[PDB]
Design a protein around this ligand. Sequence first.
Ligand SMILES: Nc1ncnc2c1ncn2[C@@H]1O[C@H](COP(=O)(O)OP(=O)(O)O)[C@@H](O)[C@H]1O
Ligand SMILES: [Mg+2]
Length: 240
Amino acid sequence: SMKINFLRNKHKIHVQGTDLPDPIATFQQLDQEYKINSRLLQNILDAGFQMPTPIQMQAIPVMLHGRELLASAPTGSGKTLAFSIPILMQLKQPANKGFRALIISPTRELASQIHRELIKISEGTGFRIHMIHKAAVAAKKFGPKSSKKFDILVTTPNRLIYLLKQDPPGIDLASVEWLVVDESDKLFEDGGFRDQLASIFLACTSHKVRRAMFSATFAYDVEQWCKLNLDNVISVSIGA
Ligand SMILES: Nc1ncnc2c1ncn2[C@@H]1O[C@H](COP(=O)(O)OP(=O)(O)O)[C@@H](O)[C@H]1O
Ligand SMILES: [Mg+2]
């Protein structure tokens, strides 16, 4: 209460929305409150991430509570772990259900960095995290008629749309529980993208699907797009 008010005031966590989950002060809370995988928590601490960052403090519990999210914080804020931890925690265990989470980033470069961070923080947990490259697309390695032993996909909008539009579809999004857009401000400014995201979401038919939009800057048509498209959105923004 005073603790919570302190967290938000000290770390400049500005939050709008209804029924807001409290921020977490420490990664240790997550063992106490959500019973996070012990290896995952040790990986996080071994990486030297002693304390969550302001965006992590509030974004993580928002996603854990199944609430759609618009999260804004400058470059360097730790937005990758802010969405990766709750995705890993929600998914619980590797499974043979095909991709259960999908992260969209503007470029191969930025996608590859998210992919490596996921690989590193999830070491020893057995989660299979993939990018789908040209030859894998050619091979239909992640097709609906494949093994389905893959958990999390990191990708770009065009690559994902290419897969969806193949005949027959080179990917099935029916089990995706989390759809995360990273660098939303950039994406809504480059393309267009709005229609892609509509068709992506339309393909994500799980009763469980939730969306989170991450952006570097708290920007107008991302804000208005979210208030308009997301369900009961919670906005979190870190002041400078
Ligand atoms: N809790 C944390 N403590 C210390 N460093 C962190 C923490 N979370 C993330 N980082 C580091 O902060 C740097 C930037 O993280 P990143 O996800 O790229 O930020 P963003 O996407 O907001 O620009 C990375 O080197 C990452 O390892
Ligand atoms: Mg980033």
